[PDB]
Amino acid sequence: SPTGLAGSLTNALSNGLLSGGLLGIMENLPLLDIIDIKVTDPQLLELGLVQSPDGHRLYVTIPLGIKLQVNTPLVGASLLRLAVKMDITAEILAVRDKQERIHLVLGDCTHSPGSLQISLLDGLGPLPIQGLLDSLTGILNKVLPELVQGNVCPLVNEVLRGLDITLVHDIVNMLIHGLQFVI
Amino acid sequence: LNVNPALSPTGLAGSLTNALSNGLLSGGLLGIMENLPLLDILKLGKVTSVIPGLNNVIDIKVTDPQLLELGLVQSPDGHRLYVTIPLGIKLQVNTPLVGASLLRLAVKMDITAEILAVRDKQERIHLVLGDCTHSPGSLQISLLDLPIQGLLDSLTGILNKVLPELVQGNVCPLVNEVLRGLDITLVHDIVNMLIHGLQFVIK
């Protein structure tokens, strides 16, 4: 069933991202370039939306989920799977272009400051290699947010350029006159 | 660079029509149309004659109902919103005169109804039906398939005078129900556009 502007956006983006091979982009992240690491189980979550108290500005949060597996010769970690959660926030801007068609684009697309969450799969124990994991978690937290937002943001931008013309104009018209439509 | 009201997530207007379109079909409007009691218009010499002389008709069968693409128009100021519901109906009329047997009529009509943004005694806002009325010059009857031109002349007259009030009387409650059962955010966003008079319907 059709919904308001808010809900219609998140539904449009989700489908757009998924169709853009978003999950496919995740499974091709080169970490070996920076043992062995294979990327699996990508999943896109419920997008979020927030609107400035003025109603003039609109931000979107894109939560992702992913599972990578590592092959270490260590004893407890012969095979290991980690589950890591990631969030991306970005501002959406109204832009007149071409013959004045007003398409939406990304503004400040950066990784959400403190929102990296890692855990162990298959019910393994941390203590057996709690000193080893410290090596990874430190590395990932300093190489993932840059790698992710460097591959996702160009996709999110291209998706916004393919939104429904009437969806855009309505949202913009709301933003301009500062009308809250998000709940 | 030209609009044509004929034939996924999208704007407010397009969401509204699709909401009403799917809301009427699951009404089920298409069933209501096909079961209109047109035979009641016809239903010892005083008990036999029935006002204008359409007495000969034996039976009136309603077939092939269809819903066309709903249309939307917004006030030039942008505070008022009207919807046109284009309907369709075939008609089969039975006479005992050999040879006629069957008259096939094709009727098309529109229902233009105002969508208001009213508020109740809880100060909360609803989308409520307003002037639901038959679109005056929308009624159009077609002959489709010898002295019939005297009966046809009488039939169309009654159809023109009854079908609107009949259809409108059966459709208006339906659409009024759907509007009150719309998505909450859909309603809210639409109202807000109207309050501030912002064109969200394409023209």
Swiss-Prot record, chain B:
Recorded GO MF terms: lipid binding
Induction context: Up-regulated in response to all-trans retinoic acid (ATRA). Up-regulated in tear fluid of patients suffering from dry eye disease. Up-regulated in response to the pro-inflammatory cytokines IL1B and TNF, and the bacteria E.coli and P.aeruginosa.
Disulfides per UniProt: 132-172
Localization terms from the record: Secreted
GO annotations of cellular component type: extracellular region; extracellular space
PTM: May be N-glycosylated.
Residue ranges that the Swiss-Prot or TrEMBL entry lists as coiled coil: none
GO biological process, one term: antibacterial humoral response
PANTHER family: BPI FOLD-CONTAINING FAMILY A MEMBER 1 (PTHR47015:SF1)
Subunit structure, interactors included: Monomer. Interacts (via N-terminus) with SCNN1B, a subunit of the heterotrimeric epithelial sodium channel (ENaC); this inhibits proteolytic activation of ENaC.
UniProt-recorded name of the protein: BPI fold-containing family A member 1
Lineage: Eukaryota, Metazoa, Chordata, Craniata, Vertebrata
Name of the gene this protein is made from: BPIFA1
